[PDB]
Amino acid sequence: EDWDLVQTLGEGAYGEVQLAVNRVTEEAVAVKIVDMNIKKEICINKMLNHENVVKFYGHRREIQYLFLEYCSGGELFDRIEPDIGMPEPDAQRFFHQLMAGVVYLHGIGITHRDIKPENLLLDERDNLKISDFGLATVFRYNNRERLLNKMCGTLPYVAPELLKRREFHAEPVDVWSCGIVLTAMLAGELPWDQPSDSCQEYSDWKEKKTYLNPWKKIDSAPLALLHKILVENPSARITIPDIKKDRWYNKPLK
Numbered sequence: 603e604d605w606d607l608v609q610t611l612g613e614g615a616y617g618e619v620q621l622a623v624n625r626v627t628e629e630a631v632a633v634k635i636v637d638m639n640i641k642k643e644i645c646i647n648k649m650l651n652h653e654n655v656v657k658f659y660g661h662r663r664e665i666q667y668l669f670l671e672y673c674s675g676g677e678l679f680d681r682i683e684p685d686i687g688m689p690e691p692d693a694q695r696f697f698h699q700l701m702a703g704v705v706y707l708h709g710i711g712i713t714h715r716d717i718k719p720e721n722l723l724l725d726e727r728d729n730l731k732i733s734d735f736g737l738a739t740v741f742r743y744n745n746r747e748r749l750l751n752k753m754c755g756t757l758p759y760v761a762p763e764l765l766k767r768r769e770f771h772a773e774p775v776d777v778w779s780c781g782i783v784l785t786a787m788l789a790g791e792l793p794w795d796q797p798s799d800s801c802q803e804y805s806d807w808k809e810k811k812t813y814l815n816p817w818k819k820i821d822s823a824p825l826a827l828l829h830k831i832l833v834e835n836p837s838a839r840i841t842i843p844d845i846k847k848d849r850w851y852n853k854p855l856k
């Protein structure tokens with residue numbers, strides 16, 4: 603082909619992700635290599651078009667190769683200093699972009715199911731892009747909502763209902779994991795291993811022990827939002843349109 607695999611960008615799972623550069627136009631893109639879920643990832647990618655979602659260029663199979671937008675900014679994960687987090691103004695901006703990305707996905711009945719800082723990429727202007735749809739699934743089709751039942755995700759970003767219920771709504775699960783992401787951004791640590799009662803840290807949160815880490819590192823305005831997102835009852839949990847009206851979310855930041 604006309605593309606040279608310059609270097610490995612990401613690794614693990616089905617295949618490593620590599621940076622390809624066109625030796626003619628010289629445009630750079632990302633190439634995901636998978637050797638035989640992948641069918642659904644491609645299908646889903648075809649539906650997506652948003653400036654806060656990693657662009658899908660197209661695909662070819664020599665082992666399937668997917669051409670994705672290249673984010674030179676790397677992953678959000680690497681903008682979080684451990685135990686510190688990041689300046690609140692950057693966190694808010696990143697959160698606003700994450701919300702737009704998610705509103706969009708949910709708007710077309712798609713749930714990501716694995717929202718975490720490793721999957722939130724940054725472009726050259728530090729714009730955030732939702733990445734990897736290999737675990738994404740349809741939760742609304744023909745205006746009909748389907749509850750989920752398969753357990754997906756990453757334990758620290760996972761919502762509690764997903765551990766204790768046979769079926770659950772998709773949207774609040776993505777909302778929960780965005781809250782865990784906000785926590786990571788403002789405190790540089792994850793609150794718990796998983797959201798179960800067997801887990802001391804989660805039990806402490808439910809009891810409102812905000813004088814513990816990581817909550818003590820978080821200003822009271824964002825923390826009030828986190829109080830509304832990390833609500834155990836997925837029916838009580840704040841929804842995105844209501845997040846959009848939250849005081850911290852609308853607070854101008856230096």
Ligand SMILES: O=c1[nH]cnc2sc3c(c12)CCCC3
Nearest residue numbers: 611612632670671672673676
């Ligand atoms: O730039 C990308 N574009 C599309 N997918 C991916 S995955 C990955 C990146 C990337 C770059 C940082 C290392 C991890």
